[PDB]
Design a protein around this ligand. Structure first.
Ligand SMILES: Cc1cccc(C)c1OCC(=O)N[C@@H](Cc1ccccc1)[C@@H](O)C[C@H](Cc1ccccc1)NC(=O)[C@H](C(C)C)N1CCCNC1=O
Lengths: 99, 99
């Protein structure tokens, strides 16, 4: 789909059996999700945004379906105000910017 | 241009007679620039990211040229680690996401 930017580019994802809304985010290197129930092992990590740092859990090779396109990769889980799909996954669904 | 997302989507901007590099950022409502010399009047404001909140200065109707496309709008100025072009300007240069 082509997505214009008059509203937040929010898409429906399926991750770990659950349905969520997430922001397609070209200004995010990584993918950050709200506190959620994920299976597997992790490594403590800190994500750094505007205004400072959040402690996150890092899960590798997690399956996600973003607007019906499958991607496998790293997902961060922690106290983000909004679910963020970052460029690590955007590249996998063939996502481009166009102007 | 079409921009893939294997690297940060950094473009050259001209703002207030100066040249800078900024991130085309679909996950940003607003445009935030590092501390810089801007002319005019302002209003104190707080921008809120992943780590909490930064105090910024809000300037209205500021001309920016982003990859050679002029846009006029609100620019926020403050202690961001990266220059961010938000959807408020991205819509003016006809920027879309495509997958
Ligand atoms: C950079 C990065 C590296 C690794 C992993 C991750 C998730 C990374 O990205 C984290 C990040 O905050 N990226 C920002 C841009 C970024 C990259 C590098 C350094 C600093 C920032 C931006 O794209 C997303 C983030 C989302 C958000 C946060 C809080 C509330 C609402 C939305 N959006 C915002 O902060 C914007 C700002 C820029 C005007 N924002 C805040 C006011 C409300 N609305 C809004 O749109």
């Amino acid at each position: 789909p082509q997505i214009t930017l008059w509203q937040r580019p929010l898409v429906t994802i399926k991750i770990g059996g659950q349905l969520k809304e997430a922001l397609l985010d070209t200004g995010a290197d990584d993918t950050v999700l709200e506190e959620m129930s994920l299976p597997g092992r992790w490594k403590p990590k800190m994500a750094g945004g505007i205004g400072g740092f959040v402690k996150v859990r890092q899960y590798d090779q997690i399956l996600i379906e973003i607007c019906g396109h499958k991607a496998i990769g790293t997902v961060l889980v922690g106290p983000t105000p909004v679910n963020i799909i970052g460029r690590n996954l955007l590249t996998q669904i063939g996502c481009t910017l166009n102007f």
